[PDB]
Design a protein around this nucleic acid. Structure first.
Ligand SMILES: CO[C@H]1[C@@H](O)[C@H](O)[C@H](OC[C@@]23C[C@@H]4[C@H](C)CC[C@H]4[C@@]4(C=O)C[C@@H]2C[C@H](C(C)C)[C@@]34C(=O)O)O[C@@H]1C
Ligand SMILES: Nc1nc2c(ncn2[C@@H]2O[C@H](COP(=O)(O)OP(=O)(O)O)[C@@H](O)[C@H]2O)c(=O)[nH]1
Ligand SMILES: [Mg+2]
Ligand SMILES: [Mg+2]
Ligand SMILES: [Zn+2]
Lengths: 52, 816, 197, 158
RNA sequence: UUCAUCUAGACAGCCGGACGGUGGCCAUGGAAGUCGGAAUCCGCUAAGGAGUGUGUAACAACUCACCGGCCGAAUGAACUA
């Protein structure tokens, strides 16, 4: 198993993210608009789904 | 053991204080089979295997058990790890006294480890723990010494938590400790293991220090503090460079040095360490490199059999000491009965009381040697004995046989040795018996000998399928295969459904698939198809026959006017339980129904018959005012009611909770115009019309399911119930343990795959048992094909070959 | 908004011209429950007023025209601090103020002032709490049907903060590494300010 | 033999659910049936009212004692002829409690409350009664609270 | 364009509190702010929703509205094309 502090550290980069609803880009958790041009920098973002 | 002699093995059984009956229990992939192979490499489904272990007087003195001699015989049963085969481990625990709990060091205490520990503790079996796959911990995870020690400590702590919360208040000190010598460490695959008792002995022989306190010093926070020669009790910071504990310094250090040298291929450093630890080589072991050299030098430096057998002998209870506290719970008969004291004392000269638990196949179909243990007295080949059934009443006659044993057999690693006699507290097989007891049971010589306990297991048959032969001609072969599988497997169940289907029920999907393969290939030997069982439903009413149903005879001379009513659930339950029975006399059954069920005394007196089959939960009430020839058509009306309540008008299922009130009849004066051929169709059509006019509904069978799962996994139970329309009834917690008990109502329709979904939601920690409880009325209309009940009605009609559309109430109804 | 600030100014004026003495008290890390307890003890004996330090400074500045004396309060109205106004013995009031110290739970992510030590004792909780101990590696054993720490363990060292597992175990064992209360920064009376001591 | 405390809440006049009491007090020694009957006795007063029944464990004995609760006291104050719980959703907590009984309840609450005056405690209990949905003098408890705030009705400052 | 906050300290940022009546009333098997129906109160308050979310079987434990400590001058929102 992973020690909880290292699990939180890894989750910071792997799980604590935003996802664009239009282009699925993995985005910073506090992003207001997607950084991708293909989606027109849309503000339609959701949190990345948490495992369990 | 060199398989000395059958008679020498008989003498070993005669020495009963020097025999250890134990079961190896663990998680699924934790090592049981490889550790048993390593135990039999120096001593020679679940059948017992025999092990021979010598001992010196110094360690024989250190045994808190009555004993005589220096030699011991270990009967080891290797129980299956899977949850789907928990009945085999339950039987092994019933037939043994001690337990070897194998725990993998990487995975620690897992779900099935906790399950087998809980079963052993509930059966009052003393555990001893072996932490396996230390080679995996040393080569895969690259723990240096302190991670390994910490993992050992955590494993011991978890095992002792389970032991403390599930051990009965009859032993108390049954906790497991490496300091006490009840925990071993080693690699079953590589064939090596050790005990800190063994290391304390080796260091007493190498340094001359006391062994008694070095036992408790080689484990825990005990530091030798070298370059100072003072056994400190804490780190004290070591005045710079904190120091290591005795376990790593003295026990783990030589093993890790050997591991590092051999696996790093330090060919010049191998011989010096090997000579220092006194390992000798063979003709071809000199030219052995890493991963093959260490594998033998560990078997030499620390024999796994020599550690495990010494632990088993020192700590695991002998039958004479285990039956003392196990006889009371293995015999429902009173504790003041000569058979109970005989089992407690394990005296071989008392009356015979032998518990047969397993059916071992014999390569001949239909013999199935009776595996079990004799708890009192001595069994003899050719001895008159009484077979007692699992439900045998000892007062009166029951399924009890007066038969004789044909041959007492010694069961071993798949070879049977005939034996003339076997004393109490030993493991043997029986030849020439068991065509007399289906599953289990006791063989007694006393005439007032209560049957032993029923061997309850934590699993139950919950996954049910229907089986039908493809070739209709070999149905006898299917029946024979079903009957032989129902005795080979202890936890498999076979029965007939309400729809006339052979139903095989098993613990889980894997166990059921294994049983079905055994049926298809060994037990039956014929090609059969497996399907989800069809569910038996009931046809009922939920209103009061909005308009009166009228039916005319084929000759038009007789008419029936009636109505349908929803008989109350309490009344239906009383009819099914026999409180309201047809054989009871009217005006007393009427009084019971009036007083206890709100019925009108006149209506309850005017009860013509019950349906279906003459005793079902449907009633016909004669409310007619002044009909003249009513007694003449009573028989035909009863016959038609039986027909209608056997084959309902929706999809031909039995009626339930239907009350047909015959309000009026018109009859022809001549008896020739109101015979059975005129009244029976008229009455069944009128009953069908009244049923289809009184808001027809169907009722489904609902299981009562109670699940035992820990605190952490009840959420999975609730999610599964909410996904399969379950209704939670009650939640409880076992006092002192985190094990809950969730009782709920799950419809039988939504019960296929329920065990698998529950096990996936709870991670294999939930244990459900399910039994038919009651009928629930489906609120949806069964006449609309798109409704929830209408889909099942349509499917049943298709399967039965009837028409698609359910005939309307206008049919069976004559306009007048 | 402005009306509310004016009301606060008026309350401050009444307190500063009706209560003879006042304690500038720091309230950092002081729970609302702790403040309620302090107020309940100080019922009658005193009255507590809190506010935004900037608004207090503005109010006092405006007041100065009439009451220039309060000009020594301004250098001490800084940090998370409030006022306890009293017409009663200074020592008694100060004891009532700093006597309510409450051992706060070892919330995670809070720097440990000292080296938190778990001690070898019989904690006396249900055995199903061993997971918390194993999460920190505290060796334990079952005695009298309860978890008992075998050897002393430094759960947190001085200088670092408390992790979630450490916090959970400490809260289970009721081990608070710090205590919080309404310390007194300044006492003012007779037209003069002085350190609490 | 200690000051151990369990603040469970039971239905007045009835024994406490075994599933609700056994899980925590099973090591201590308290026989669940004894705990149940003790709770029933302690709740006889508030017959048929959800009441917090505090329990002290000493020498394997339960000191079942109903800790006063605002809502529970209000319910008993309306005198609440025995409700049919099974009957229907939220059998209405209608009726008319009065200043006298609300003041009595506030007097029983003052010890633990943090209001400055018994007037404040009465306003608290009045908010509880308003949530419950009962009536005061056929006037909204919020209206009575406002009356207290604006002098029309005066709480005895005892 | 319009409406707002702001040296009586705005926005953002970091740190502290985030309570008491109270597990408010009700089916529910369980529902304690956080499955839901209605009720949106009072107290102490500088301030805290009969609760913004995570979480529990229920608790618990975190979190946010709201108020404070630091900083010190502008800032926020909805729209228009
Ligand atoms: C412990 O063993 C028990 C339990 O597993 C359970 O009670 C099981 O139930 C069987 C059923 C019994 C129901 C009543 C008798 C009326 C309808 C019957 C069922 C549906 O058709 C519901 C359960 C499930 C079975 C159908 C779906 C095949 C039943 C059957 O026998 O047909 O019976 C076995 C013998
Ligand atoms: N490295 C290592 N592998 C092991 C050990 N014991 C068992 N295994 C592996 O585990 C696998 C299956 O284990 P097995 O003993 O058959 O499981 P069980 O008998 O059902 O408990 C085998 O392929 C072994 O290689 C061990 O001590 N060390
Ligand atoms: Mg195996
Ligand atoms: Mg919730
Ligand atoms: Zn995007």
């Amino acid at each position: 198993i992973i020690e909880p502090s290292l699990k939180a550290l890894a989750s910071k980069y792997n799980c604590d993210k935003s996802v664009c609803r239009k282009c699925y880009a993995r985005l910073p958790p506090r992003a207001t608009n997607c950084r991708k041009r293909k989606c027109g920098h849309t503000n339609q973002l959701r949190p990345k789904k948490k495992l369990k | 053991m060199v398989a000395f002699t059958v008679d020498q093995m008989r003498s070993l059984m005669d020495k009963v204080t020097n025999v250890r009956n134990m079961s190896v229990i663990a998680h699924v992939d934790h090592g049981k089979s490889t550790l048993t192979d390593s135990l039999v490499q120096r001593a020679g489904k679940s059948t017992a295997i025999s092990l021979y272990s010598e001992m010196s007087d110094e360690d024989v003195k250190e045994i808190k058990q009555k004993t005589d001699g220096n030699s011991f015989l270990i009967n080891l049963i290797d129980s299956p790890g899977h949850v789907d085969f928990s009945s085999e481990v339950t039987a092994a625990l019933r037939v043994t006294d001690g337990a070897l709990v194998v725990v993998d060091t990487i995975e620690g205490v897992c779900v099935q480890t906790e399950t087998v520990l809980r079963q052993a503790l509930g059966e009052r079996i003393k555990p001893v723990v072996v932490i396996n796959k230390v080679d995996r911990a040393l080569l895969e995870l690259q723990v240096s010494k302190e991670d390994l020690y910490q993992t050992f400590a955590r494993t011991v702590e978890s095992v002792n938590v389970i032991v403390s919360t599930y051990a009965d208040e009859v032993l108390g000190d049954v906790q497991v400790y490496p300091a006490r010598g009840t925990v071993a460490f080693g690699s079953g695959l590589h064939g090596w293991a050790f005990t800190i008792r063994q290391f304390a002995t080796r260091y007493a022989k190498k340094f001359g220090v006391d062994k008694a306190k070095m036992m408790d010093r080689l484990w825990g926070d005990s530091f030798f503090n070298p370059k100072t020669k003072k056994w400190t009790n804490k780190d004290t910071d070591a005045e710079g460079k904190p120091l290591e504990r005795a376990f790593n310094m003295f026990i783990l250090d030589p093993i890790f040095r050997l591991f590092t040298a051999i696996m790093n291929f330090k060919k010049d450093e191998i011989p010096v360490l090997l000579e220092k630890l006194e390992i000798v080589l063979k003709g071809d072991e000199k030219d052995l490199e890493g991963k093959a050299l260490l594998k033998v030098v560990m078997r030499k430096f620390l024999p796994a059999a020599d550690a495990l057998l010494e632990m088993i002998v020192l700590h695991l209870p002998s039958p004479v000491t285990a039956q003392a506290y196990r006889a009371e719970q293995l015999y429902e008969g009173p504790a003041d009965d000569a058979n109970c004291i005989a089992i407690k004392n394990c005296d071989p000269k008392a009356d015979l009381m032998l518990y047969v638990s397993k059916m071992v196949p014999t390569s001949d179909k239909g013999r199935f040697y009776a595996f079990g243990r004799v708890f009192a007295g001595t069994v003899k080949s050719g001895q008159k004995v009484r077979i007692q059934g699992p439900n045998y009443v000892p007062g009166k006659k029951d399924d009890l046989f007066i038969k004789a044993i044909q041959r007492v057999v010694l069961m071993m690693g798949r070879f049977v040795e005939p034996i003339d006699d076997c004393p109490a507290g030993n493991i043997i097989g029986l030849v020439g018996i068991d065509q007399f007891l289906l599953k289990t049971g006791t063989l007694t010589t006393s005439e007032t000998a209560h049957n032993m306990k029923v061997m309850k297991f934590s699993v139950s048959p919950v996954v049910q399928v229907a089986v039908e032969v493809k070739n209709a001609n070999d149905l006898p072969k299917l029946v024979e295969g079903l009957k032989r599988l129902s005795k080979s497997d202890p936890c498999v169940l076979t029965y007939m459904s309400e729809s006339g289907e052979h139903i095989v029920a098993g613990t889980g999907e894997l166990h059921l698939e294994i049983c079905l393969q055994d049926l298809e290939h060994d037990h039956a030997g014929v090609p059969l198809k497996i399907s989800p069982p069809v569910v038996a439903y009931r046809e009922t009413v939920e209103s009061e026959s909005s308009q009166t149903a009228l039916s005319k005879s084929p000759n038009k001379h007789n008419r029936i006017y009636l109505k349908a009513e929803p008989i109350d659930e309490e009344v239906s339950l009383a009819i099914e339980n026999g409180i309201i029975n047809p054989r009871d006399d009217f005006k007393a059954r009427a009084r019971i129904m009036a007083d206890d069920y709100g019925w009108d005394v006149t209506d309850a007196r005017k009860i013509w018959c019950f349906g279906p089959d003459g005793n079902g939960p449907n009633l016909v009430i004669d409310q007619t005012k002044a009909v003249q020839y009513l007694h003449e058509i009573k028989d035909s009306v009863v016959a038609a009611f039986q027909w209608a309540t056997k084959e309902g008008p929706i999809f031909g299922e039995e009626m339930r909770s239907v009350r047909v009130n015959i309000l009026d009849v018109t009859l022809h004066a001549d008896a020739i115009h109101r015979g059975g051929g005129q009244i029976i169709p008229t009455m069944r059509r009128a009953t069908y019309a009244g049923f289809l006019l009184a808001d027809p509904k169907i009722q489904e069978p609902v299981f009562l399911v109670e699940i035992q799962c820990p605190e952490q996994a009840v959420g999975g139970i609730y999610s599964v119930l909410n996904k399969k329309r379950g209704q939670v009834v009650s939640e409880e917690q076992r006092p002192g343990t985190p094990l809950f008990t969730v009782k709920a109502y799950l419809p039988v329709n939504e019960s296929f795959g329920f065990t698998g979904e529950l096990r996936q939601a709870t991670g294999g920690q939930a244990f459900p048992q399910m039994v038919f409880d009651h009928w629930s009325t489906l609120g949806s209309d069964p006449l609309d094909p798109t409704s929830k009940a209408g889909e099942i009605v349509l499917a049943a009609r298709k399967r039965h070959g009837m028409k698609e559309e359910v005939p309307g109430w206008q049919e069976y109804y004559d306009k007048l | 908004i402005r009306e509310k600030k004016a009301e606060y100014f008026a309350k401050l004026r009444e307190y500063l011209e009706e209560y003879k003495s006042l304690f500038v008290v720091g309230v950092d890390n002081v729970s609302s429950q702790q403040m309620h307890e302090v107020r309940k003890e100080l019922r009658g004996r005193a009255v507590v007023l809190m506010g935004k330090n900037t608004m207090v400074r503005r109010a006092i500045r405006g007041f100065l025209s009439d009451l220039p004396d309060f000009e020594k309060l301004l250098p001490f109205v800084k940090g998370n601090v409030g006022f306890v106004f009293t017409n009663e013995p200074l020592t008694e009031i100060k004891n009532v103020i700093v006597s309510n110290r409450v051992a706060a739970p070892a919330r995670a992510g809070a720097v440990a002032p000292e080296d938190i030590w778990v001690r070898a004792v019989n904690t006396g909780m249900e055995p199903g709490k061993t997971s918390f101990f194993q999460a920190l590696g505290v060796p334990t054993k079952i005695a009298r049907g309860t978890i008992e720490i075998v050897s002393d363990v430094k759960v947190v060292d001085a200088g670092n903060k408390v992790g979630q597992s450490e916090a959970s175990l400490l809260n289970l064992l009721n081990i608070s590494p710090f205590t919080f209360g309404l310390t007194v920064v300044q006492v003012y009376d007779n037209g003069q300010v002085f350190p609490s001591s | 033999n200690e000051v151990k405390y369990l603040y469970l809440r039971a239905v007045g006049g009835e024994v406490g659910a075994s599933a609700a009491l056994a899980p925590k007090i099973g090591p201590l020694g308290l026989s669940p049936k004894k705990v149940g009957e003790d709770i029933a006795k302690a709740t006889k007063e508030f017959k048929g009212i959800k009441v917090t029944v505090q329990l002290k464990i000493q020498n394997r004995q339960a000191a079942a004692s109903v800790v006063p609760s605002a809502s529970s006291l209000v319910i008993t104050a309306l005198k609440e002829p025995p409700r049919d719980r099974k009957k229907d959703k939220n059998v209405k907590h209608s009726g008319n409690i009065q200043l006298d009984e609300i003041i009595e309840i506030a007097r029983q609450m003052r010890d633990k409350s943090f209001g400055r005056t018994l007037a404040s405690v009465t306003k608290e209990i009045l908010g509880t009664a308003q949530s419950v949905g009962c009536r005061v003098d056929f006037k909204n408890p919020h209206d009575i609270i406002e009356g207290i705030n604006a002098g029309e009705i005066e709480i005895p400052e005892n």
